[PDB]
Amino acid sequence: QCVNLRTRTQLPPAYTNSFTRGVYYPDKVFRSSVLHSTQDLFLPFFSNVTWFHNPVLPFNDGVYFASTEKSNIIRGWIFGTTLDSKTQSLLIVNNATNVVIKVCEFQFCNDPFLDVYESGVYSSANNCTFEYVSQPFLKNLREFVFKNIDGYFKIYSKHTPINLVRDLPQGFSALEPLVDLPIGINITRFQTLLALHRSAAAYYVGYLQPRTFLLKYNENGTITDAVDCALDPLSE
Amino acid sequence: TKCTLKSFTVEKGIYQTSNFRVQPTESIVRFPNITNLCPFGEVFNATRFASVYAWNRKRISNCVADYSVLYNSASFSTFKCYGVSPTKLNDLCFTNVYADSFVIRGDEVRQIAPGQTGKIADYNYKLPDDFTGCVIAWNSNNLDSKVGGNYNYRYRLFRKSNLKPFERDISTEIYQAGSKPCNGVEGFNCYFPLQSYGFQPTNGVGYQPYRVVVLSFELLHAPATVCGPKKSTNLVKNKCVNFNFNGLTGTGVLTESNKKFLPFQQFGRDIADTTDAVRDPQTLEILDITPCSFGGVSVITPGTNTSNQVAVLYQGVNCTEVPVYSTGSNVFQTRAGCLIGAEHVNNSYECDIPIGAGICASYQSI
Amino acid sequence: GNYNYRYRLFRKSNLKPFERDISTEIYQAGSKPCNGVEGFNCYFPLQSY
Ligand SMILES: *[C@@H]1O[C@H](CO)[C@@H](O[C@@H]2O[C@H](CO)[C@@H](O)[C@H](O)[C@H]2NC(C)=O)[C@H](O)[C@H]1NC(C)=O
Ligand SMILES: *[C@@H]1O[C@H](CO)[C@@H](O[C@@H]2O[C@H](CO)[C@@H](O)[C@H](O)[C@H]2NC(C)=O)[C@H](O)[C@H]1NC(C)=O
Ligand SMILES: *[C@@H]1O[C@H](CO)[C@@H](O[C@@H]2O[C@H](CO)[C@@H](O)[C@H](O)[C@H]2NC(C)=O)[C@H](O)[C@H]1NC(C)=O
Ligand SMILES: *[C@@H]1O[C@H](CO)[C@@H](O[C@@H]2O[C@H](CO)[C@@H](O)[C@H](O)[C@H]2NC(C)=O)[C@H](O)[C@H]1NC(C)=O
Ligand SMILES: *[C@@H]1O[C@H](CO)[C@@H](O[C@@H]2O[C@H](CO)[C@@H](O)[C@H](O)[C@H]2NC(C)=O)[C@H](O)[C@H]1NC(C)=O
Ligand SMILES: *[C@@H]1O[C@H](CO)[C@@H](O[C@@H]2O[C@H](CO)[C@@H](O)[C@H](O)[C@H]2NC(C)=O)[C@H](O)[C@H]1NC(C)=O
Ligand SMILES: *[C@@H]1O[C@H](CO)[C@@H](O)[C@H](O)[C@H]1NC(C)=O
Ligand SMILES: *[C@@H]1O[C@H](CO)[C@@H](O)[C@H](O)[C@H]1NC(C)=O
Ligand SMILES: *[C@@H]1O[C@H](CO)[C@@H](O)[C@H](O)[C@H]1NC(C)=O
Ligand SMILES: *[C@@H]1O[C@H](CO)[C@@H](O)[C@H](O)[C@H]1NC(C)=O
């Protein structure tokens, strides 16, 4: 039932500044009022993050995703390498009630969209291996971090109430771990899912690099401040 | 003291002989409540089983399987495990399981085995020599066999070649033994490869229908997800014991803590990477760990030349868990530890044999 | 065929170095006690060549 559209969804690929966003808890250890230095994959401070106002983008080591969501327009994500039945493909969709995660050799069309009048963006669903159902993920800022290391898919998330107009605010907010998948795939590209009825989508995408950070833990074990060591000499 | 000093005489002084530590009492292991059992019920209690050449294949992953109940069942005639012992299967585990279920003859139960040949072994299902797993076979004469003949069950009999391991053939092509061509009609040199089973209630043991399920385990590089439940036990407090909290092992005394973990951590460390707090996977409460006491022991003597009685000092040890020198004489508790053998007086003299914290001992008794 | 050569097949625990065991007793493989009677989950530990 999937057909190509007429107009090209050429969202303007602008650039903007990351500031101090994209910090997540690296493990499940409790620390109280202490400074801890750790080396891992992070988003560099004051980086160049791409802004879209639905192309295929590379995955690289990890992905930082941000949405200035108004009334839940974004719905899901697709992951894979060949994006067909030749190789395993991953699908995540947050519908009105639950979240569904599937790992199958789907047969996607050339333009995915959820549609409203559940899943009909794939002609076939063969050799399904992993299935998962859980509670929903989602004028709000929705921040997500996706990583894939040694057969494990890590998803971190955070929600923020913001009143600023366009760009990312100046502040600090650590990202808590959300979901782990014990599945081994070699994803290299990914795609975004919109439930656009047949009748304008702003989000931000950034990449990750390995580096060292310094984190401060308060009395209650919450990360309140961080320092990027690979920056101006004062930070070092 | 003499043995450590390697002499038969000792002069007046204080010497450090050995150490002392509290031994652990018992062990405790904790684990989550255990859920998501593997669905073995619908396989071994299935109403119907497919044919031998159309064996049902089932994938098992992401669940916990209890093989103890399967092993303890006495209703199964044959339970043969080759790769591993069934008793130890509950400990080790692999990444996925393949189940092949079908029905065969009673006399053909040993066809499906490594290094075995036969009609089924060469035309319906083949098992490799290096196969690892288990086979469970049990009689189904009372259910599968029919008074009118259970002709629904069939088996492959004719094929030019044999079957590869883990290979299924369901082809209905008219087998041509000879060189005479047949246009889909069986003739002198053409026969139907499939033959129907004729089970009857009064047939005899060996020809009766037998339900057979073969379980194979595979260990692809993806993490293992299916194997036995992790047994747990109760917990104790205020006693130096060794613990295995969700795979984190260590010894010490467990107490109730007032720390407030944030809802996703599992344990905490203060500094220098030493764990101090844990969370039990069942009650979901924060416990505090303290290393149970230890310290050195020292002896105070007035010299072998003078007398032969001594005093014993345990360094940095509370005078509550000392243990022939368990009770002995009057026992003194000092800021330097605990002391047994000497007597506390109210006077004050010059210091002969230093002890610590502003106090010392001498020989009068000591 | 030679059948004078037999080897152990089941044991309660592993053998110590330079240890010899010659006892031939039924093995209680299952939880059900054999009580010295061979039956289900009860086997002779010596197997021939
Ligand atoms: C939103 O997603 C949930 C989760 O998949 C849907 O609930 C399932 O719907 C299917 C439809 O056949 C049922 O088979 C499942 O039993 C349902 N599961 C649960 C837990 O309810 C739900 O229908 C979806 N709703 C919409 C509007 O798409
Ligand atoms: C369909 O799924 C099966 C298993 O679910 C795949 O079989 C695996 O293929 C890989 C490819 O090399 C092997 O390494 C594994 O040993 C196979 N067995 C497993 C994982 O149990 C099969 O490849 C899939 N088909 C397609 C077209 O992808
Ligand atoms: C850290 O934890 C402490 C301990 O609970 C929090 O202090 C409480 O704060 C609330 C509201 O701020 C008060 O109603 C309680 O009376 C406080 N408890 C005590 C013992 O004073 C504190 O708010 C938490 N957060 C920070 C940033 O310190
Ligand atoms: C098939 O069903 C029977 C009938 O319930 C199961 O046998 C039960 O096994 C449990 C296991 O401890 C016993 O407590 C029950 O007393 C048994 N019932 C009877 C009537 O004997 C059998 O386990 C099932 N097979 C599976 C689950 O594979
Ligand atoms: C694990 O299972 C235990 C056993 O049921 C759960 O403990 C129960 O907790 C409720 C909560 O008030 C009590 O009312 C019950 O009396 C407890 N059970 C027993 C036997 O005392 C525990 O909550 C479970 N935990 C998880 C994380 O599943
Ligand atoms: C040795 O242990 C005992 C008991 O654990 C300690 O006695 C406690 O001392 C505290 C502090 O004064 C009191 O609050 C408790 O009520 C005492 N408990 C008992 C049972 O008397 C004793 O202080 C310890 N020794 C040292 C040197 O601290
Ligand atoms: C981000 O990239 C754009 C184009 O690549 C560039 O014009 C802009 O200056 C960059 N911003 C930085 C480096 O902060
Ligand atoms: C992904 O592909 C690369 C190269 O094609 C290969 O080396 C790797 O093993 C693959 N991983 C998975 C999980 O398929
Ligand atoms: C102690 O030593 C002195 C000299 O070193 C000696 O005269 C005396 O007998 C000794 N005391 C004994 C052996 O009890
Ligand atoms: C003498 O010492 C004992 C303990 O050794 C003490 O209980 C007592 O009060 C002391 N008496 C005087 C007069 O100091």
PDB file of C-alpha atoms in Angstrom, chain B residues 72-264:
ATOM      1  CA  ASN B  72      12.512 -36.225  36.544  1.00  0.00           C
ATOM      2  CA  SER B  73       9.540 -37.238  34.378  1.00  0.00           C
ATOM      3  CA  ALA B  74       9.155 -41.026  34.349  1.00  0.00           C
ATOM      4  CA  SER B  75       6.619 -41.091  31.491  1.00  0.00           C
ATOM      5  CA  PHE B  76       9.345 -40.908  28.815  1.00  0.00           C
ATOM      6  CA  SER B  77      10.804 -44.203  27.611  1.00  0.00           C
ATOM      7  CA  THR B  78      14.002 -42.853  26.023  1.00  0.00           C
ATOM      8  CA  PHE B  79      15.998 -39.829  27.236  1.00  0.00           C
ATOM      9  CA  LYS B  80      19.422 -39.802  25.566  1.00  0.00           C
ATOM     10  CA  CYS B  81      21.873 -36.904  25.879  1.00  0.00           C
ATOM     11  CA  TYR B  82      25.205 -37.133  24.050  1.00  0.00           C
ATOM     12  CA  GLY B  83      26.897 -33.728  24.045  1.00  0.00           C
ATOM     13  CA  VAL B  84      26.515 -32.989  27.762  1.00  0.00           C
ATOM     14  CA  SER B  85      25.237 -34.703  30.881  1.00  0.00           C
ATOM     15  CA  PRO B  86      21.569 -33.871  31.614  1.00  0.00           C
ATOM     16  CA  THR B  87      22.333 -33.167  35.283  1.00  0.00           C
ATOM     17  CA  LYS B  88      24.863 -30.421  34.498  1.00  0.00           C
ATOM     18  CA  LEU B  89      22.761 -28.890  31.702  1.00  0.00           C
ATOM     19  CA  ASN B  90      21.116 -26.558  34.241  1.00  0.00           C
ATOM     20  CA  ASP B  91      24.402 -24.656  34.711  1.00  0.00           C
ATOM     21  CA  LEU B  92      25.911 -24.141  31.250  1.00  0.00           C
ATOM     22  CA  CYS B  93      23.841 -22.663  28.446  1.00  0.00           C
ATOM     23  CA  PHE B  94      23.921 -21.585  24.811  1.00  0.00           C
ATOM     24  CA  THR B  95      22.405 -18.786  22.747  1.00  0.00           C
ATOM     25  CA  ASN B  96      19.484 -20.619  21.125  1.00  0.00           C
ATOM     26  CA  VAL B  97      17.659 -23.951  20.978  1.00  0.00           C
ATOM     27  CA  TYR B  98      16.121 -25.817  18.035  1.00  0.00           C
ATOM     28  CA  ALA B  99      13.380 -28.379  18.697  1.00  0.00           C
ATOM     29  CA  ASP B 100      12.437 -31.026  16.118  1.00  0.00           C
ATOM     30  CA  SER B 101       9.253 -32.956  16.920  1.00  0.00           C
ATOM     31  CA  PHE B 102       7.746 -35.885  15.009  1.00  0.00           C
ATOM     32  CA  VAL B 103       6.426 -39.457  15.351  1.00  0.00           C
ATOM     33  CA  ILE B 104       8.258 -42.635  14.292  1.00  0.00           C
ATOM     34  CA  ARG B 105       8.146 -46.380  14.879  1.00  0.00           C
ATOM     35  CA  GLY B 106       9.195 -48.010  18.127  1.00  0.00           C
ATOM     36  CA  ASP B 107      11.878 -50.027  16.334  1.00  0.00           C
ATOM     37  CA  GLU B 108      13.192 -46.939  14.497  1.00  0.00           C
ATOM     38  CA  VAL B 109      13.960 -44.930  17.647  1.00  0.00           C
ATOM     39  CA  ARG B 110      17.690 -45.674  17.321  1.00  0.00           C
ATOM     40  CA  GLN B 111      17.789 -44.625  13.657  1.00  0.00           C
ATOM     41  CA  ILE B 112      17.996 -40.967  14.758  1.00  0.00           C
ATOM     42  CA  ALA B 113      21.449 -41.001  16.358  1.00  0.00           C
ATOM     43  CA  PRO B 114      25.003 -40.073  15.322  1.00  0.00           C
ATOM     44  CA  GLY B 115      26.627 -42.813  13.275  1.00  0.00           C
ATOM     45  CA  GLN B 116      23.328 -44.544  12.491  1.00  0.00           C
ATOM     46  CA  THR B 117      21.715 -45.565   9.207  1.00  0.00           C
ATOM     47  CA  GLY B 118      18.258 -46.664   8.154  1.00  0.00           C
ATOM     48  CA  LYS B 119      15.190 -45.765   6.152  1.00  0.00           C
ATOM     49  CA  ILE B 120      14.427 -42.738   8.328  1.00  0.00           C
ATOM     50  CA  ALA B 121      18.126 -41.968   8.858  1.00  0.00           C
ATOM     51  CA  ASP B 122      18.739 -41.789   5.088  1.00  0.00           C
ATOM     52  CA  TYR B 123      15.389 -40.621   3.658  1.00  0.00           C
ATOM     53  CA  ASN B 124      13.493 -38.629   6.325  1.00  0.00           C
ATOM     54  CA  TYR B 125      15.865 -37.103   8.897  1.00  0.00           C
ATOM     55  CA  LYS B 126      19.638 -37.261   9.355  1.00  0.00           C
ATOM     56  CA  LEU B 127      21.690 -36.364  12.427  1.00  0.00           C
ATOM     57  CA  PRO B 128      25.385 -35.438  12.182  1.00  0.00           C
ATOM     58  CA  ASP B 129      28.060 -37.368  14.033  1.00  0.00           C
ATOM     59  CA  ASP B 130      29.206 -34.188  15.816  1.00  0.00           C
ATOM     60  CA  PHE B 131      25.642 -33.415  16.931  1.00  0.00           C
ATOM     61  CA  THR B 132      25.192 -32.166  20.494  1.00  0.00           C
ATOM     62  CA  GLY B 133      21.870 -32.108  22.300  1.00  0.00           C
ATOM     63  CA  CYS B 134      19.250 -34.507  23.611  1.00  0.00           C
ATOM     64  CA  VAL B 135      16.549 -36.828  22.273  1.00  0.00           C
ATOM     65  CA  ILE B 136      13.329 -37.644  24.144  1.00  0.00           C
ATOM     66  CA  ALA B 137      11.085 -40.447  22.880  1.00  0.00           C
ATOM     67  CA  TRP B 138       7.920 -41.830  24.437  1.00  0.00           C
ATOM     68  CA  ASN B 139       5.210 -44.231  23.319  1.00  0.00           C
ATOM     69  CA  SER B 140       2.031 -42.799  21.790  1.00  0.00           C
ATOM     70  CA  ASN B 141       0.159 -46.024  21.008  1.00  0.00           C
ATOM     71  CA  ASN B 142      -2.796 -45.060  23.213  1.00  0.00           C
ATOM     72  CA  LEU B 143      -3.268 -41.736  21.376  1.00  0.00           C
ATOM     73  CA  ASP B 144      -1.724 -41.644  17.892  1.00  0.00           C
ATOM     74  CA  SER B 145      -2.529 -45.223  16.869  1.00  0.00           C
ATOM     75  CA  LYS B 146      -6.027 -45.648  15.441  1.00  0.00           C
ATOM     76  CA  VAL B 147      -8.398 -48.610  15.365  1.00  0.00           C
ATOM     77  CA  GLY B 148      -8.945 -47.906  11.665  1.00  0.00           C
ATOM     78  CA  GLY B 149      -5.267 -47.206  11.035  1.00  0.00           C
ATOM     79  CA  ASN B 150      -3.460 -43.896  11.573  1.00  0.00           C
ATOM     80  CA  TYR B 151      -2.757 -43.485   7.865  1.00  0.00           C
ATOM     81  CA  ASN B 152      -2.370 -39.704   8.209  1.00  0.00           C
ATOM     82  CA  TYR B 153       1.223 -40.231   9.368  1.00  0.00           C
ATOM     83  CA  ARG B 154       3.571 -41.028   6.481  1.00  0.00           C
ATOM     84  CA  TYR B 155       7.285 -41.490   5.866  1.00  0.00           C
ATOM     85  CA  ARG B 156       9.671 -41.068   2.948  1.00  0.00           C
ATOM     86  CA  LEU B 157      10.979 -44.339   1.503  1.00  0.00           C
ATOM     87  CA  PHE B 158      12.365 -43.586  -1.982  1.00  0.00           C
ATOM     88  CA  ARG B 159      15.075 -41.100  -2.942  1.00  0.00           C
ATOM     89  CA  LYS B 160      18.128 -41.214  -5.197  1.00  0.00           C
ATOM     90  CA  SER B 161      20.366 -39.634  -2.540  1.00  0.00           C
ATOM     91  CA  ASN B 162      20.454 -39.489   1.248  1.00  0.00           C
ATOM     92  CA  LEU B 163      19.674 -36.566   3.574  1.00  0.00           C
ATOM     93  CA  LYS B 164      22.137 -34.023   4.912  1.00  0.00           C
ATOM     94  CA  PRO B 165      22.188 -33.284   8.655  1.00  0.00           C
ATOM     95  CA  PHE B 166      19.317 -31.023   9.749  1.00  0.00           C
ATOM     96  CA  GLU B 167      17.755 -31.275   6.279  1.00  0.00           C
ATOM     97  CA  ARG B 168      14.051 -31.732   5.529  1.00  0.00           C
ATOM     98  CA  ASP B 169      12.692 -33.270   2.319  1.00  0.00           C
ATOM     99  CA  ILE B 170       8.973 -32.958   1.568  1.00  0.00           C
ATOM    100  CA  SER B 171       9.156 -33.437  -2.196  1.00  0.00           C
ATOM    101  CA  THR B 172       6.306 -35.485  -3.671  1.00  0.00           C
ATOM    102  CA  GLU B 173       8.011 -36.191  -7.008  1.00  0.00           C
ATOM    103  CA  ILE B 174       7.454 -39.710  -8.340  1.00  0.00           C
ATOM    104  CA  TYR B 175      10.706 -41.548  -7.631  1.00  0.00           C
ATOM    105  CA  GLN B 176      12.132 -43.292 -10.707  1.00  0.00           C
ATOM    106  CA  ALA B 177      14.341 -46.193  -9.624  1.00  0.00           C
ATOM    107  CA  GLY B 178      14.935 -47.344 -13.203  1.00  0.00           C
ATOM    108  CA  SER B 179      15.726 -45.541 -16.436  1.00  0.00           C
ATOM    109  CA  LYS B 180      12.166 -45.738 -17.798  1.00  0.00           C
ATOM    110  CA  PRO B 181      10.655 -42.222 -17.903  1.00  0.00           C
ATOM    111  CA  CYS B 182       7.263 -41.623 -16.309  1.00  0.00           C
ATOM    112  CA  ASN B 183       4.970 -38.682 -17.077  1.00  0.00           C
ATOM    113  CA  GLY B 184       3.850 -38.343 -13.463  1.00  0.00           C
ATOM    114  CA  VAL B 185       2.298 -41.837 -13.378  1.00  0.00           C
ATOM    115  CA  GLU B 186       3.970 -44.605 -11.388  1.00  0.00           C
ATOM    116  CA  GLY B 187       4.870 -47.663 -13.437  1.00  0.00           C
ATOM    117  CA  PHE B 188       7.340 -50.544 -13.514  1.00  0.00           C
ATOM    118  CA  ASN B 189      10.303 -48.363 -12.487  1.00  0.00           C
ATOM    119  CA  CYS B 190       8.374 -45.528 -10.795  1.00  0.00           C
ATOM    120  CA  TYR B 191       7.109 -45.611  -7.208  1.00  0.00           C
ATOM    121  CA  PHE B 192       5.672 -43.118  -4.740  1.00  0.00           C
ATOM    122  CA  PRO B 193       8.418 -42.046  -2.288  1.00  0.00           C
ATOM    123  CA  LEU B 194       5.974 -41.725   0.638  1.00  0.00           C
ATOM    124  CA  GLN B 195       4.333 -44.606   2.513  1.00  0.00           C
ATOM    125  CA  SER B 196       1.500 -44.405   5.038  1.00  0.00           C
ATOM    126  CA  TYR B 197       1.674 -45.721   8.597  1.00  0.00           C
ATOM    127  CA  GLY B 198      -0.753 -48.445   9.627  1.00  0.00           C
ATOM    128  CA  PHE B 199      -0.759 -48.267  13.423  1.00  0.00           C
ATOM    129  CA  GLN B 200      -3.439 -50.326  15.181  1.00  0.00           C
ATOM    130  CA  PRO B 201      -4.247 -50.732  18.892  1.00  0.00           C
ATOM    131  CA  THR B 202      -3.152 -54.395  18.731  1.00  0.00           C
ATOM    132  CA  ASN B 203       0.120 -54.262  16.794  1.00  0.00           C
ATOM    133  CA  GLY B 204       2.926 -54.959  19.270  1.00  0.00           C
ATOM    134  CA  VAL B 205       5.750 -53.019  20.884  1.00  0.00           C
ATOM    135  CA  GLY B 206       8.274 -51.775  18.318  1.00  0.00           C
ATOM    136  CA  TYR B 207       5.777 -50.951  15.559  1.00  0.00           C
ATOM    137  CA  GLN B 208       3.668 -48.631  17.737  1.00  0.00           C
ATOM    138  CA  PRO B 209       3.769 -44.862  17.172  1.00  0.00           C
ATOM    139  CA  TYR B 210       6.387 -43.101  19.295  1.00  0.00           C
ATOM    140  CA  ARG B 211       6.605 -39.336  19.722  1.00  0.00           C
ATOM    141  CA  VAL B 212      10.195 -38.097  19.418  1.00  0.00           C
ATOM    142  CA  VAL B 213      11.505 -34.597  20.166  1.00  0.00           C
ATOM    143  CA  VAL B 214      15.155 -33.691  19.539  1.00  0.00           C
ATOM    144  CA  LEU B 215      16.611 -30.596  21.208  1.00  0.00           C
ATOM    145  CA  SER B 216      19.789 -29.044  19.803  1.00  0.00           C
ATOM    146  CA  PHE B 217      21.723 -26.123  21.284  1.00  0.00           C
ATOM    147  CA  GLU B 218      23.663 -23.531  19.285  1.00  0.00           C
ATOM    148  CA  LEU B 219      26.163 -20.950  20.579  1.00  0.00           C
ATOM    149  CA  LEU B 220      26.371 -18.215  17.940  1.00  0.00           C
ATOM    150  CA  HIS B 221      28.452 -15.212  19.041  1.00  0.00           C
ATOM    151  CA  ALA B 222      25.319 -13.388  20.219  1.00  0.00           C
ATOM    152  CA  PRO B 223      24.929 -13.499  24.022  1.00  0.00           C
ATOM    153  CA  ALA B 224      23.262 -16.559  25.517  1.00  0.00           C
ATOM    154  CA  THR B 225      19.650 -15.994  26.552  1.00  0.00           C
ATOM    155  CA  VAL B 226      18.152 -19.387  27.526  1.00  0.00           C
ATOM    156  CA  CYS B 227      19.088 -21.541  30.530  1.00  0.00           C
ATOM    157  CA  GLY B 228      18.205 -22.662  34.027  1.00  0.00           C
ATOM    158  CA  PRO B 229      16.906 -20.568  36.902  1.00  0.00           C
ATOM    159  CA  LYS B 230      19.401 -19.217  39.418  1.00  0.00           C
ATOM    160  CA  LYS B 231      18.550 -20.595  42.853  1.00  0.00           C
ATOM    161  CA  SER B 232      18.498 -18.084  45.711  1.00  0.00           C
ATOM    162  CA  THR B 233      18.142 -18.147  49.492  1.00  0.00           C
ATOM    163  CA  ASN B 234      17.354 -15.946  52.473  1.00  0.00           C
ATOM    164  CA  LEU B 235      19.659 -13.275  53.884  1.00  0.00           C
ATOM    165  CA  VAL B 236      21.180 -12.597  57.300  1.00  0.00           C
ATOM    166  CA  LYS B 237      22.476  -9.427  58.939  1.00  0.00           C
ATOM    167  CA  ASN B 238      25.001  -8.370  61.587  1.00  0.00           C
ATOM    168  CA  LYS B 239      27.213 -11.389  60.849  1.00  0.00           C
ATOM    169  CA  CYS B 240      30.419 -11.527  58.801  1.00  0.00           C
ATOM    170  CA  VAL B 241      29.423 -13.760  55.869  1.00  0.00           C
ATOM    171  CA  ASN B 242      30.283 -14.111  52.191  1.00  0.00           C
ATOM    172  CA  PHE B 243      27.718 -13.076  49.589  1.00  0.00           C
ATOM    173  CA  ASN B 244      27.083 -13.386  45.845  1.00  0.00           C
ATOM    174  CA  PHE B 245      24.637 -10.560  45.145  1.00  0.00           C
ATOM    175  CA  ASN B 246      23.632 -10.962  41.477  1.00  0.00           C
ATOM    176  CA  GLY B 247      27.130 -12.105  40.538  1.00  0.00           C
ATOM    177  CA  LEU B 248      28.939  -9.568  42.747  1.00  0.00           C
ATOM    178  CA  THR B 249      30.903 -11.573  45.313  1.00  0.00           C
ATOM    179  CA  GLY B 250      32.500 -10.432  48.542  1.00  0.00           C
ATOM    180  CA  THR B 251      32.818 -10.995  52.265  1.00  0.00           C
ATOM    181  CA  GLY B 252      31.716  -8.769  55.115  1.00  0.00           C
ATOM    182  CA  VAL B 253      28.900  -7.878  57.488  1.00  0.00           C
ATOM    183  CA  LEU B 254      25.626  -6.524  56.099  1.00  0.00           C
ATOM    184  CA  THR B 255      23.612  -3.800  57.830  1.00  0.00           C
ATOM    185  CA  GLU B 256      20.685  -1.534  57.042  1.00  0.00           C
ATOM    186  CA  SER B 257      21.719   1.712  55.359  1.00  0.00           C
ATOM    187  CA  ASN B 258      20.112   5.146  55.102  1.00  0.00           C
ATOM    188  CA  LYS B 259      21.509   5.900  51.637  1.00  0.00           C
ATOM    189  CA  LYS B 260      19.024   6.684  48.864  1.00  0.00           C
ATOM    190  CA  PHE B 261      19.929   5.080  45.550  1.00  0.00           C
ATOM    191  CA  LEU B 262      18.547   6.645  42.449  1.00  0.00           C
ATOM    192  CA  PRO B 263      16.031   4.210  40.913  1.00  0.00           C
ATOM    193  CA  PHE B 264      18.362   2.615  38.323  1.00  0.00           C
TER     194      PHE B 264
END
